[PDB]
Swiss-Prot record:
Zn(2+) 2 binds at residues 83, 167, 209. This is Metallo-beta-lactamase type 2. Its EC number is 3.5.2.6. Enterobacteriaceae carrying this gene (identified by PCR) have been isolated in Sweden, India, Pakistan, Bangladesh, England, Scotland, Northern Ireland, Australia and the USA. The organisms they were identified in were K.pneumoniae, Enterobacter cloacae, E.coli, Proteus spp, Citrobacter freundii, Morganella morganii, Providencia spp and Klebsille oxytoca. In India most isolates were from community-acquired infections rather than hospital-acquired infections, indicating the gene is widespread in the environment. Monomer. It is found in: Periplasm. One of its GO terms (molecular function) is zinc ion binding. Binds 2 Zn(2+) ions per subunit. Inhibits by captopril, thiorphan, dimercaprol and tiopronin. This enzyme is not susceptible to inactivation by the beta-lactamase-blocking agents clavulanic acid. It catalyses: a beta-lactam + H2O = a substituted beta-amino acid. It comes from Klebsiella pneumoniae.
Length: 229
């Protein structure tokens, strides 16, 4: 059930949940797909992650207008790399309230990103401080510890079997942990396992660079990360 919409791909995952996919021709790595989420919560839409670029992110909003036709109340982005935050200006131009881990917003300028408007902060156990995530509806935001990056955050969708690991989690057949340039290799395995423990009911694991998978994505990612230590 993939829907080609311009240069992007959209796939319904649940009655109120769709995955957005965008591509960037990155020299040395081919045309890399990146996934995020679109969630309808009653009369509004919530977005997880931008596309790689402003133009692609505007195209996500165009798809939302044509297929859902409800306002986008907010977006949350899951770390300060291009695939997750590269389209921040398009969200701001559209009047959408944007949220990121405080550390992502601090890192955004040096990473070439535009910061989100609002900062999420996290309790010692990883759960978002609820006052910093107002009106998130079914989105449950969890900081699992440093892994793919020090700022990576994850999102469960209450009322569904879906949890989103972003670039922390790779699929159950993945050959590597991908881009470790900003990774915490010592803590990766525990962070991947903490994501699994935060969302024990999630049987569909969504991630940045592979199609949705079973929880074997979590166990396999953690087992690969065991080897980094
Ligand atoms: O780490 P990601 O997935 O957020 C962004 C990304 C994806 C693929 C290859 C990369 C190479 C260098 C830097 N970033 C890359
Ligand atoms: Zn990244
Ligand atoms: Zn990635």
């Amino acid at each position: 059930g993939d829907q080609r919409f311009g240069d992007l791909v959209f796939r319904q995952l649940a009655p109120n949940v769709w995955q957005h996919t965008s591509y960037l021709d990155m020299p040395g790595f081919g045309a890399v797909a990146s996934n995020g989420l679109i969630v309808r919560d009653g009369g509004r839409v919530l977005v997880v992650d931008t596309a790689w670029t402003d133009d692609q992110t505007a195209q996500i909003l165009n798809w939302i207008k044509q297929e859902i036709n409800l306002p986008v109340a907010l977006a949350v982005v899951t770390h300060a790399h291009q695939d997750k935050m590269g389209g921040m200006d398009a969200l701001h131009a559209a009047g959408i309230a944007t949220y990121a881990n405080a550390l992502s917003n601090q890192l955004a300028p040096q990473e070439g990103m535009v910061a989100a408007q609002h900062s999420l902060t996290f309790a010692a156990n990883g759960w978002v401080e609820p006052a910093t995530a107002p009106n998130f509806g079914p989105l449950k935001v969890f900081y699992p510890g440093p892994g793919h990056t020090s700022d990576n955050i994850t999102v469960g969708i209450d009322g569904t079997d879906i949890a989103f690991g972003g670039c922390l989690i790779k699929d159950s057949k993945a050959k590597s942990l991908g881009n470790l340039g900003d990774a915490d290799t010592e803590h990766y395995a525990a962070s991947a396992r903490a994501f699994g423990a935060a969302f024990p009911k999630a049987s569909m694991i969504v991630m940045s660079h592979s199609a949705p998978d079973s929880r074997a994505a979590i166990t396999h990612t953690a087992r690969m990360a065991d080897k980094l230590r």
